Amino acid sequence: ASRSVIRSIIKSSRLEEDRKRYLMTLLDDIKGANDLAKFHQMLVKIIMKHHHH
């Protein structure tokens, strides 16, 4: 997905702030559309797993 969409998903999430910042450092190191898409795919899985507690 786009960097802006991924950023918003992390920022709006209920993850611990330091864990949000961790994910942003990873995102900053990601390069390319394919890799951004894979990151977003991982991210959604993480968020939904965390939410489902």
mmCIF file with all atom_site columns, N, CA, C and O in Angstrom:
data_model
loop_
_atom_site.group_PDB
_atom_site.id
_atom_site.type_symbol
_atom_site.label_atom_id
_atom_site.label_alt_id
_atom_site.label_comp_id
_atom_site.label_asym_id
_atom_site.label_entity_id
_atom_site.label_seq_id
_atom_site.pdbx_PDB_ins_code
_atom_site.Cartn_x
_atom_site.Cartn_y
_atom_site.Cartn_z
_atom_site.occupancy
_atom_site.B_iso_or_equiv
_atom_site.pdbx_formal_charge
_atom_site.auth_seq_id
_atom_site.auth_comp_id
_atom_site.auth_asym_id
_atom_site.auth_atom_id
_atom_site.pdbx_PDB_model_num
ATOM 1   N N  . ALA A 1 1  ? 0.865  -1.213  0.000  1.00 0.00 ? 1  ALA A N  1
ATOM 2   C CA . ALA A 1 1  ? 0.000  0.000   0.000  1.00 0.00 ? 1  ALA A CA 1
ATOM 3   C C  . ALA A 1 1  ? 0.881  1.235   0.000  1.00 0.00 ? 1  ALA A C  1
ATOM 4   O O  . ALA A 1 1  ? 2.106  1.121   -0.008 1.00 0.00 ? 1  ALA A O  1
ATOM 5   N N  . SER A 1 2  ? 0.280  2.420   -0.001 1.00 0.00 ? 2  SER A N  1
ATOM 6   C CA . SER A 1 2  ? 1.096  3.633   0.044  1.00 0.00 ? 2  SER A CA 1
ATOM 7   C C  . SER A 1 2  ? 1.706  3.841   1.449  1.00 0.00 ? 2  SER A C  1
ATOM 8   O O  . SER A 1 2  ? 1.189  3.374   2.458  1.00 0.00 ? 2  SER A O  1
ATOM 9   N N  . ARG A 1 3  ? 2.814  4.562   1.492  1.00 0.00 ? 3  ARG A N  1
ATOM 10  C CA . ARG A 1 3  ? 3.458  4.904   2.739  1.00 0.00 ? 3  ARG A CA 1
ATOM 11  C C  . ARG A 1 3  ? 2.498  5.676   3.667  1.00 0.00 ? 3  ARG A C  1
ATOM 12  O O  . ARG A 1 3  ? 2.513  5.526   4.887  1.00 0.00 ? 3  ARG A O  1
ATOM 13  N N  . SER A 1 4  ? 1.684  6.542   3.080  1.00 0.00 ? 4  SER A N  1
ATOM 14  C CA . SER A 1 4  ? 0.807  7.390   3.854  1.00 0.00 ? 4  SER A CA 1
ATOM 15  C C  . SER A 1 4  ? -0.300 6.556   4.505  1.00 0.00 ? 4  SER A C  1
ATOM 16  O O  . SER A 1 4  ? -0.612 6.735   5.703  1.00 0.00 ? 4  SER A O  1
ATOM 17  N N  . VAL A 1 5  ? -0.814 5.576   3.768  1.00 0.00 ? 5  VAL A N  1
ATOM 18  C CA . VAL A 1 5  ? -1.839 4.696   4.314  1.00 0.00 ? 5  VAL A CA 1
ATOM 19  C C  . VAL A 1 5  ? -1.282 3.823   5.448  1.00 0.00 ? 5  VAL A C  1
ATOM 20  O O  . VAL A 1 5  ? -1.889 3.704   6.495  1.00 0.00 ? 5  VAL A O  1
ATOM 21  N N  . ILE A 1 6  ? -0.081 3.290   5.250  1.00 0.00 ? 6  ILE A N  1
ATOM 22  C CA . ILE A 1 6  ? 0.562  2.464   6.271  1.00 0.00 ? 6  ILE A CA 1
ATOM 23  C C  . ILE A 1 6  ? 0.830  3.294   7.523  1.00 0.00 ? 6  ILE A C  1
ATOM 24  O O  . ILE A 1 6  ? 0.569  2.860   8.630  1.00 0.00 ? 6  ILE A O  1
ATOM 25  N N  . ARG A 1 7  ? 1.360  4.503   7.340  1.00 0.00 ? 7  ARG A N  1
ATOM 26  C CA . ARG A 1 7  ? 1.629  5.389   8.460  1.00 0.00 ? 7  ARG A CA 1
ATOM 27  C C  . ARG A 1 7  ? 0.358  5.636   9.285  1.00 0.00 ? 7  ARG A C  1
ATOM 28  O O  . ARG A 1 7  ? 0.391  5.592   10.531 1.00 0.00 ? 7  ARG A O  1
ATOM 29  N N  . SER A 1 8  ? -0.747 5.936   8.600  1.00 0.00 ? 8  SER A N  1
ATOM 30  C CA . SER A 1 8  ? -2.035 6.195   9.262  1.00 0.00 ? 8  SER A CA 1
ATOM 31  C C  . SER A 1 8  ? -2.529 4.965   10.028 1.00 0.00 ? 8  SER A C  1
ATOM 32  O O  . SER A 1 8  ? -3.005 5.085   11.145 1.00 0.00 ? 8  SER A O  1
ATOM 33  N N  . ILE A 1 9  ? -2.369 3.773   9.436  1.00 0.00 ? 9  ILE A N  1
ATOM 34  C CA . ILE A 1 9  ? -2.779 2.533   10.118 1.00 0.00 ? 9  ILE A CA 1
ATOM 35  C C  . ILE A 1 9  ? -1.987 2.319   11.403 1.00 0.00 ? 9  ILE A C  1
ATOM 36  O O  . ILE A 1 9  ? -2.547 1.943   12.450 1.00 0.00 ? 9  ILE A O  1
ATOM 37  N N  . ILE A 1 10 ? -0.681 2.594   11.365 1.00 0.00 ? 10 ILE A N  1
ATOM 38  C CA . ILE A 1 10 ? 0.128  2.467   12.577 1.00 0.00 ? 10 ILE A CA 1
ATOM 39  C C  . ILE A 1 10 ? -0.261 3.520   13.609 1.00 0.00 ? 10 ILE A C  1
ATOM 40  O O  . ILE A 1 10 ? -0.444 3.222   14.780 1.00 0.00 ? 10 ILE A O  1
ATOM 41  N N  . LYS A 1 11 ? -0.340 4.771   13.174 1.00 0.00 ? 11 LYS A N  1
ATOM 42  C CA . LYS A 1 11 ? -0.655 5.875   14.093 1.00 0.00 ? 11 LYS A CA 1
ATOM 43  C C  . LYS A 1 11 ? -2.029 5.709   14.760 1.00 0.00 ? 11 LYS A C  1
ATOM 44  O O  . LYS A 1 11 ? -2.187 5.981   15.950 1.00 0.00 ? 11 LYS A O  1
ATOM 45  N N  . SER A 1 12 ? -3.016 5.247   14.006 1.00 0.00 ? 12 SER A N  1
ATOM 46  C CA . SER A 1 12 ? -4.372 5.128   14.541 1.00 0.00 ? 12 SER A CA 1
ATOM 47  C C  . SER A 1 12 ? -4.587 3.895   15.385 1.00 0.00 ? 12 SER A C  1
ATOM 48  O O  . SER A 1 12 ? -5.615 3.771   16.052 1.00 0.00 ? 12 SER A O  1
ATOM 49  N N  . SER A 1 13 ? -3.618 2.979   15.364 1.00 0.00 ? 13 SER A N  1
ATOM 50  C CA . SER A 1 13 ? -3.760 1.698   16.062 1.00 0.00 ? 13 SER A CA 1
ATOM 51  C C  . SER A 1 13 ? -3.647 1.854   17.573 1.00 0.00 ? 13 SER A C  1
ATOM 52  O O  . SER A 1 13 ? -3.312 2.917   18.074 1.00 0.00 ? 13 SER A O  1
ATOM 53  N N  . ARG A 1 14 ? -3.966 0.786   18.296 1.00 0.00 ? 14 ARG A N  1
ATOM 54  C CA . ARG A 1 14 ? -3.902 0.789   19.742 1.00 0.00 ? 14 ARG A CA 1
ATOM 55  C C  . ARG A 1 14 ? -2.630 0.119   20.261 1.00 0.00 ? 14 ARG A C  1
ATOM 56  O O  . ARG A 1 14 ? -2.548 -0.233  21.431 1.00 0.00 ? 14 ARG A O  1
ATOM 57  N N  . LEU A 1 15 ? -1.619 -0.003  19.411 1.00 0.00 ? 15 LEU A N  1
ATOM 58  C CA . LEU A 1 15 ? -0.342 -0.551  19.866 1.00 0.00 ? 15 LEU A CA 1
ATOM 59  C C  . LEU A 1 15 ? 0.360  0.397   20.823 1.00 0.00 ? 15 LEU A C  1
ATOM 60  O O  . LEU A 1 15 ? 0.162  1.609   20.748 1.00 0.00 ? 15 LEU A O  1
ATOM 61  N N  . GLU A 1 16 ? 1.258  -0.146  21.656 1.00 0.00 ? 16 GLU A N  1
ATOM 62  C CA . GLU A 1 16 ? 2.059  0.678   22.549 1.00 0.00 ? 16 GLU A CA 1
ATOM 63  C C  . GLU A 1 16 ? 2.847  1.670   21.707 1.00 0.00 ? 16 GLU A C  1
ATOM 64  O O  . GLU A 1 16 ? 3.270  1.342   20.597 1.00 0.00 ? 16 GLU A O  1
ATOM 65  N N  . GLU A 1 17 ? 3.017  2.886   22.213 1.00 0.00 ? 17 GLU A N  1
ATOM 66  C CA . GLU A 1 17 ? 3.673  3.927   21.431 1.00 0.00 ? 17 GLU A CA 1
ATOM 67  C C  . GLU A 1 17 ? 5.086  3.534   20.981 1.00 0.00 ? 17 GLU A C  1
ATOM 68  O O  . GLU A 1 17 ? 5.484  3.831   19.860 1.00 0.00 ? 17 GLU A O  1
ATOM 69  N N  . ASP A 1 18 ? 5.842  2.861   21.838 1.00 0.00 ? 18 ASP A N  1
ATOM 70  C CA . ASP A 1 18 ? 7.193  2.496   21.459 1.00 0.00 ? 18 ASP A CA 1
ATOM 71  C C  . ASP A 1 18 ? 7.168  1.428   20.363 1.00 0.00 ? 18 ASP A C  1
ATOM 72  O O  . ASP A 1 18 ? 8.077  1.338   19.556 1.00 0.00 ? 18 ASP A O  1
ATOM 73  N N  . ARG A 1 19 ? 6.118  0.625   20.342 1.00 0.00 ? 19 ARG A N  1
ATOM 74  C CA . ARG A 1 19 ? 5.981  -0.388  19.291 1.00 0.00 ? 19 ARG A CA 1
ATOM 75  C C  . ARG A 1 19 ? 5.538  0.227   17.985 1.00 0.00 ? 19 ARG A C  1
ATOM 76  O O  . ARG A 1 19 ? 5.936  -0.204  16.907 1.00 0.00 ? 19 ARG A O  1
ATOM 77  N N  . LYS A 1 20 ? 4.729  1.277   18.077 1.00 0.00 ? 20 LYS A N  1
ATOM 78  C CA . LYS A 1 20 ? 4.405  2.057   16.895 1.00 0.00 ? 20 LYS A CA 1
ATOM 79  C C  . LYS A 1 20 ? 5.674  2.658   16.299 1.00 0.00 ? 20 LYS A C  1
ATOM 80  O O  . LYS A 1 20 ? 5.892  2.636   15.092 1.00 0.00 ? 20 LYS A O  1
ATOM 81  N N  . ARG A 1 21 ? 6.526  3.200   17.157 1.00 0.00 ? 21 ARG A N  1
ATOM 82  C CA . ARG A 1 21 ? 7.733  3.855   16.657 1.00 0.00 ? 21 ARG A CA 1
ATOM 83  C C  . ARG A 1 21 ? 8.679  2.845   16.045 1.00 0.00 ? 21 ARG A C  1
ATOM 84  O O  . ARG A 1 21 ? 9.299  3.121   15.013 1.00 0.00 ? 21 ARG A O  1
ATOM 85  N N  . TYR A 1 22 ? 8.747  1.655   16.642 1.00 0.00 ? 22 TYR A N  1
ATOM 86  C CA . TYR A 1 22 ? 9.533  0.568   16.042 1.00 0.00 ? 22 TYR A CA 1
ATOM 87  C C  . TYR A 1 22 ? 9.086  0.304   14.592 1.00 0.00 ? 22 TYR A C  1
ATOM 88  O O  . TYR A 1 22 ? 9.906  0.254   13.664 1.00 0.00 ? 22 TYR A O  1
ATOM 89  N N  . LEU A 1 23 ? 7.787  0.124   14.410 1.00 0.00 ? 23 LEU A N  1
ATOM 90  C CA . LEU A 1 23 ? 7.234  -0.167  13.081 1.00 0.00 ? 23 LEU A CA 1
ATOM 91  C C  . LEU A 1 23 ? 7.495  0.969   12.101 1.00 0.00 ? 23 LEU A C  1
ATOM 92  O O  . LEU A 1 23 ? 7.769  0.743   10.927 1.00 0.00 ? 23 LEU A O  1
ATOM 93  N N  . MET A 1 24 ? 7.461  2.202   12.591 1.00 0.00 ? 24 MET A N  1
ATOM 94  C CA . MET A 1 24 ? 7.820  3.328   11.708 1.00 0.00 ? 24 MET A CA 1
ATOM 95  C C  . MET A 1 24 ? 9.278  3.293   11.282 1.00 0.00 ? 24 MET A C  1
ATOM 96  O O  . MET A 1 24 ? 9.587  3.642   10.150 1.00 0.00 ? 24 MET A O  1
ATOM 97  N N  . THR A 1 25 ? 10.174 2.792   12.143 1.00 0.00 ? 25 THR A N  1
ATOM 98  C CA . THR A 1 25 ? 11.589 2.739   11.717 1.00 0.00 ? 25 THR A CA 1
ATOM 99  C C  . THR A 1 25 ? 11.744 1.689   10.638 1.00 0.00 ? 25 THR A C  1
ATOM 100 O O  . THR A 1 25 ? 12.526 1.852   9.701  1.00 0.00 ? 25 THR A O  1
ATOM 101 N N  . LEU A 1 26 ? 10.990 0.592   10.757 1.00 0.00 ? 26 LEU A N  1
ATOM 102 C CA . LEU A 1 26 ? 11.046 -0.420  9.713  1.00 0.00 ? 26 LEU A CA 1
ATOM 103 C C  . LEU A 1 26 ? 10.533 0.149   8.404  1.00 0.00 ? 26 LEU A C  1
ATOM 104 O O  . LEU A 1 26 ? 11.125 -0.071  7.342  1.00 0.00 ? 26 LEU A O  1
ATOM 105 N N  . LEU A 1 27 ? 9.391  0.831   8.485  1.00 0.00 ? 27 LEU A N  1
ATOM 106 C CA . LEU A 1 27 ? 8.758  1.398   7.289  1.00 0.00 ? 27 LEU A CA 1
ATOM 107 C C  . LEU A 1 27 ? 9.733  2.348   6.597  1.00 0.00 ? 27 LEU A C  1
ATOM 108 O O  . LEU A 1 27 ? 9.832  2.358   5.365  1.00 0.00 ? 27 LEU A O  1
ATOM 109 N N  . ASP A 1 28 ? 10.462 3.122   7.386  1.00 0.00 ? 28 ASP A N  1
ATOM 110 C CA . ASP A 1 28 ? 11.410 4.082   6.807  1.00 0.00 ? 28 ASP A CA 1
ATOM 111 C C  . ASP A 1 28 ? 12.525 3.425   6.008  1.00 0.00 ? 28 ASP A C  1
ATOM 112 O O  . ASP A 1 28 ? 13.097 4.051   5.128  1.00 0.00 ? 28 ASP A O  1
ATOM 113 N N  . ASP A 1 29 ? 12.840 2.173   6.338  1.00 0.00 ? 29 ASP A N  1
ATOM 114 C CA . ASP A 1 29 ? 13.878 1.417   5.646  1.00 0.00 ? 29 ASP A CA 1
ATOM 115 C C  . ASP A 1 29 ? 13.360 0.623   4.451  1.00 0.00 ? 29 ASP A C  1
ATOM 116 O O  . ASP A 1 29 ? 14.160 0.090   3.682  1.00 0.00 ? 29 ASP A O  1
ATOM 117 N N  . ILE A 1 30 ? 12.035 0.490   4.325  1.00 0.00 ? 30 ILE A N  1
ATOM 118 C CA . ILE A 1 30 ? 11.421 -0.228  3.208  1.00 0.00 ? 30 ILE A CA 1
ATOM 119 C C  . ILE A 1 30 ? 11.558 0.594   1.937  1.00 0.00 ? 30 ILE A C  1
ATOM 120 O O  . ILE A 1 30 ? 11.377 1.803   1.966  1.00 0.00 ? 30 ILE A O  1
ATOM 121 N N  . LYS A 1 31 ? 11.877 -0.070  0.826  1.00 0.00 ? 31 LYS A N  1
ATOM 122 C CA . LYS A 1 31 ? 11.990 0.582   -0.476 1.00 0.00 ? 31 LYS A CA 1
ATOM 123 C C  . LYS A 1 31 ? 11.256 -0.228  -1.538 1.00 0.00 ? 31 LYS A C  1
ATOM 124 O O  . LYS A 1 31 ? 11.449 -1.448  -1.646 1.00 0.00 ? 31 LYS A O  1
ATOM 125 N N  . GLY A 1 32 ? 10.386 0.435   -2.292 1.00 0.00 ? 32 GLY A N  1
ATOM 126 C CA . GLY A 1 32 ? 9.728  -0.194  -3.418 1.00 0.00 ? 32 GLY A CA 1
ATOM 127 C C  . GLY A 1 32 ? 8.286  -0.596  -3.150 1.00 0.00 ? 32 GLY A C  1
ATOM 128 O O  . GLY A 1 32 ? 7.894  -0.850  -2.011 1.00 0.00 ? 32 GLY A O  1
ATOM 129 N N  . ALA A 1 33 ? 7.491  -0.622  -4.212 1.00 0.00 ? 33 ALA A N  1
ATOM 130 C CA . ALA A 1 33 ? 6.056  -0.866  -4.111 1.00 0.00 ? 33 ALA A CA 1
ATOM 131 C C  . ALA A 1 33 ? 5.739  -2.279  -3.627 1.00 0.00 ? 33 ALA A C  1
ATOM 132 O O  . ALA A 1 33 ? 4.869  -2.479  -2.789 1.00 0.00 ? 33 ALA A O  1
ATOM 133 N N  . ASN A 1 34 ? 6.429  -3.267  -4.182 1.00 0.00 ? 34 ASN A N  1
ATOM 134 C CA . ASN A 1 34 ? 6.268  -4.651  -3.757 1.00 0.00 ? 34 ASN A CA 1
ATOM 135 C C  . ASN A 1 34 ? 6.562  -4.855  -2.280 1.00 0.00 ? 34 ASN A C  1
ATOM 136 O O  . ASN A 1 34 ? 5.805  -5.524  -1.589 1.00 0.00 ? 34 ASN A O  1
ATOM 137 N N  . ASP A 1 35 ? 7.671  -4.290  -1.801 1.00 0.00 ? 35 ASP A N  1
ATOM 138 C CA . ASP A 1 35 ? 8.056  -4.409  -0.398 1.00 0.00 ? 35 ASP A CA 1
ATOM 139 C C  . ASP A 1 35 ? 7.106  -3.637  0.516  1.00 0.00 ? 35 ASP A C  1
ATOM 140 O O  . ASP A 1 35 ? 6.842  -4.071  1.633  1.00 0.00 ? 35 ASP A O  1
ATOM 141 N N  . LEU A 1 36 ? 6.590  -2.506  0.024  1.00 0.00 ? 36 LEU A N  1
ATOM 142 C CA . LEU A 1 36 ? 5.585  -1.745  0.785  1.00 0.00 ? 36 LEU A CA 1
ATOM 143 C C  . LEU A 1 36 ? 4.298  -2.545  0.942  1.00 0.00 ? 36 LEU A C  1
ATOM 144 O O  . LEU A 1 36 ? 3.660  -2.519  1.997  1.00 0.00 ? 36 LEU A O  1
ATOM 145 N N  . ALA A 1 37 ? 3.926  -3.262  -0.116 1.00 0.00 ? 37 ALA A N  1
ATOM 146 C CA . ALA A 1 37 ? 2.725  -4.082  -0.105 1.00 0.00 ? 37 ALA A CA 1
ATOM 147 C C  . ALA A 1 37 ? 2.850  -5.248  0.870  1.00 0.00 ? 37 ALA A C  1
ATOM 148 O O  . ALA A 1 37 ? 1.899  -5.576  1.578  1.00 0.00 ? 37 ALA A O  1
ATOM 149 N N  . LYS A 1 38 ? 4.028  -5.865  0.915  1.00 0.00 ? 38 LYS A N  1
ATOM 150 C CA . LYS A 1 38 ? 4.283  -6.971  1.826  1.00 0.00 ? 38 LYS A CA 1
ATOM 151 C C  . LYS A 1 38 ? 4.283  -6.496  3.274  1.00 0.00 ? 38 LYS A C  1
ATOM 152 O O  . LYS A 1 38 ? 3.823  -7.194  4.174  1.00 0.00 ? 38 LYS A O  1
ATOM 153 N N  . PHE A 1 39 ? 4.800  -5.284  3.492  1.00 0.00 ? 39 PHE A N  1
ATOM 154 C CA . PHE A 1 39 ? 4.824  -4.693  4.826  1.00 0.00 ? 39 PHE A CA 1
ATOM 155 C C  . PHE A 1 39 ? 3.403  -4.436  5.310  1.00 0.00 ? 39 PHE A C  1
ATOM 156 O O  . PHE A 1 39 ? 3.071  -4.734  6.447  1.00 0.00 ? 39 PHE A O  1
ATOM 157 N N  . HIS A 1 40 ? 2.595  -3.848  4.450  1.00 0.00 ? 40 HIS A N  1
ATOM 158 C CA . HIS A 1 40 ? 1.207  -3.559  4.767  1.00 0.00 ? 40 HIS A CA 1
ATOM 159 C C  . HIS A 1 40 ? 0.466  -4.865  5.076  1.00 0.00 ? 40 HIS A C  1
ATOM 160 O O  . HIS A 1 40 ? -0.295 -4.943  6.046  1.00 0.00 ? 40 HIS A O  1
ATOM 161 N N  . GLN A 1 41 ? 0.730  -5.901  4.285  1.00 0.00 ? 41 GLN A N  1
ATOM 162 C CA . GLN A 1 41 ? 0.118  -7.204  4.530  1.00 0.00 ? 41 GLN A CA 1
ATOM 163 C C  . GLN A 1 41 ? 0.472  -7.780  5.892  1.00 0.00 ? 41 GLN A C  1
ATOM 164 O O  . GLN A 1 41 ? -0.436 -8.179  6.625  1.00 0.00 ? 41 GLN A O  1
ATOM 165 N N  . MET A 1 42 ? 1.755  -7.741  6.269  1.00 0.00 ? 42 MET A N  1
ATOM 166 C CA . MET A 1 42 ? 2.208  -8.111  7.630  1.00 0.00 ? 42 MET A CA 1
ATOM 167 C C  . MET A 1 42 ? 1.552  -7.240  8.689  1.00 0.00 ? 42 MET A C  1
ATOM 168 O O  . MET A 1 42 ? 1.160  -7.708  9.739  1.00 0.00 ? 42 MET A O  1
ATOM 169 N N  . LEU A 1 43 ? 1.534  -5.932  8.449  1.00 0.00 ? 43 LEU A N  1
ATOM 170 C CA . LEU A 1 43 ? 0.983  -5.003  9.416  1.00 0.00 ? 43 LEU A CA 1
ATOM 171 C C  . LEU A 1 43 ? -0.484 -5.301  9.760  1.00 0.00 ? 43 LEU A C  1
ATOM 172 O O  . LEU A 1 43 ? -0.878 -5.295  10.936 1.00 0.00 ? 43 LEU A O  1
ATOM 173 N N  . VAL A 1 44 ? -1.294 -5.557  8.742  1.00 0.00 ? 44 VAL A N  1
ATOM 174 C CA . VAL A 1 44 ? -2.724 -5.797  8.970  1.00 0.00 ? 44 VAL A CA 1
ATOM 175 C C  . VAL A 1 44 ? -2.906 -7.063  9.808  1.00 0.00 ? 44 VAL A C  1
ATOM 176 O O  . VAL A 1 44 ? -3.697 -7.092  10.750 1.00 0.00 ? 44 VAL A O  1
ATOM 177 N N  . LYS A 1 45 ? -2.102 -8.081  9.523  1.00 0.00 ? 45 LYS A N  1
ATOM 178 C CA . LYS A 1 45 ? -2.134 -9.318  10.310 1.00 0.00 ? 45 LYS A CA 1
ATOM 179 C C  . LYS A 1 45 ? -1.793 -9.040  11.751 1.00 0.00 ? 45 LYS A C  1
ATOM 180 O O  . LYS A 1 45 ? -2.469 -9.531  12.634 1.00 0.00 ? 45 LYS A O  1
ATOM 181 N N  . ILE A 1 46 ? -0.729 -8.260  11.998 1.00 0.00 ? 46 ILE A N  1
ATOM 182 C CA . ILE A 1 46 ? -0.329 -7.882  13.356 1.00 0.00 ? 46 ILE A CA 1
ATOM 183 C C  . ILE A 1 46 ? -1.429 -7.106  14.097 1.00 0.00 ? 46 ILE A C  1
ATOM 184 O O  . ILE A 1 46 ? -1.730 -7.381  15.257 1.00 0.00 ? 46 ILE A O  1
ATOM 185 N N  . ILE A 1 47 ? -1.991 -6.104  13.432 1.00 0.00 ? 47 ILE A N  1
ATOM 186 C CA . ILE A 1 47 ? -3.016 -5.272  14.056 1.00 0.00 ? 47 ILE A CA 1
ATOM 187 C C  . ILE A 1 47 ? -4.249 -6.126  14.412 1.00 0.00 ? 47 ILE A C  1
ATOM 188 O O  . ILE A 1 47 ? -4.805 -5.999  15.489 1.00 0.00 ? 47 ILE A O  1
ATOM 189 N N  . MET A 1 48 ? -4.685 -6.978  13.495 1.00 0.00 ? 48 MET A N  1
ATOM 190 C CA . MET A 1 48 ? -5.937 -7.716  13.702 1.00 0.00 ? 48 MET A CA 1
ATOM 191 C C  . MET A 1 48 ? -5.742 -8.815  14.781 1.00 0.00 ? 48 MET A C  1
ATOM 192 O O  . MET A 1 48 ? -6.657 -9.144  15.525 1.00 0.00 ? 48 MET A O  1
ATOM 193 N N  . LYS A 1 49 ? -4.521 -9.328  14.891 1.00 0.00 ? 49 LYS A N  1
ATOM 194 C CA . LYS A 1 49 ? -4.223 -10.348 15.884 1.00 0.00 ? 49 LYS A CA 1
ATOM 195 C C  . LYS A 1 49 ? -4.245 -9.682  17.232 1.00 0.00 ? 49 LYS A C  1
ATOM 196 O O  . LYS A 1 49 ? -4.813 -10.220 18.169 1.00 0.00 ? 49 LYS A O  1
ATOM 197 N N  . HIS A 1 50 ? -3.645 -8.489  17.317 1.00 0.00 ? 50 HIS A N  1
ATOM 198 C CA . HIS A 1 50 ? -3.577 -7.707  18.553 1.00 0.00 ? 50 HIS A CA 1
ATOM 199 C C  . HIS A 1 50 ? -4.967 -7.272  18.985 1.00 0.00 ? 50 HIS A C  1
ATOM 200 O O  . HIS A 1 50 ? -5.308 -7.328  20.168 1.00 0.00 ? 50 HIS A O  1
ATOM 201 N N  . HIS A 1 51 ? -5.767 -6.852  18.013 1.00 0.00 ? 51 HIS A N  1
ATOM 202 C CA . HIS A 1 51 ? -7.148 -6.454  18.277 1.00 0.00 ? 51 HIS A CA 1
ATOM 203 C C  . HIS A 1 51 ? -8.007 -7.609  18.808 1.00 0.00 ? 51 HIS A C  1
ATOM 204 O O  . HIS A 1 51 ? -8.936 -7.401  19.588 1.00 0.00 ? 51 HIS A O  1
ATOM 205 N N  . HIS A 1 52 ? -7.745 -8.813  18.327 1.00 0.00 ? 52 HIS A N  1
ATOM 206 C CA . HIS A 1 52 ? -8.601 -9.953  18.650 1.00 0.00 ? 52 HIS A CA 1
ATOM 207 C C  . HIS A 1 52 ? -8.389 -10.579 20.022 1.00 0.00 ? 52 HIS A C  1
ATOM 208 O O  . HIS A 1 52 ? -9.189 -11.426 20.425 1.00 0.00 ? 52 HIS A O  1
ATOM 209 N N  . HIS A 1 53 ? -7.353 -10.154 20.756 1.00 0.00 ? 53 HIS A N  1
ATOM 210 C CA . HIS A 1 53 ? -7.375 -10.402 22.228 1.00 0.00 ? 53 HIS A CA 1
ATOM 211 C C  . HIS A 1 53 ? -8.633 -9.852  22.915 1.00 0.00 ? 53 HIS A C  1
ATOM 212 O O  . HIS A 1 53 ? -9.310 -8.937  22.410 1.00 0.00 ? 53 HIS A O  1
#
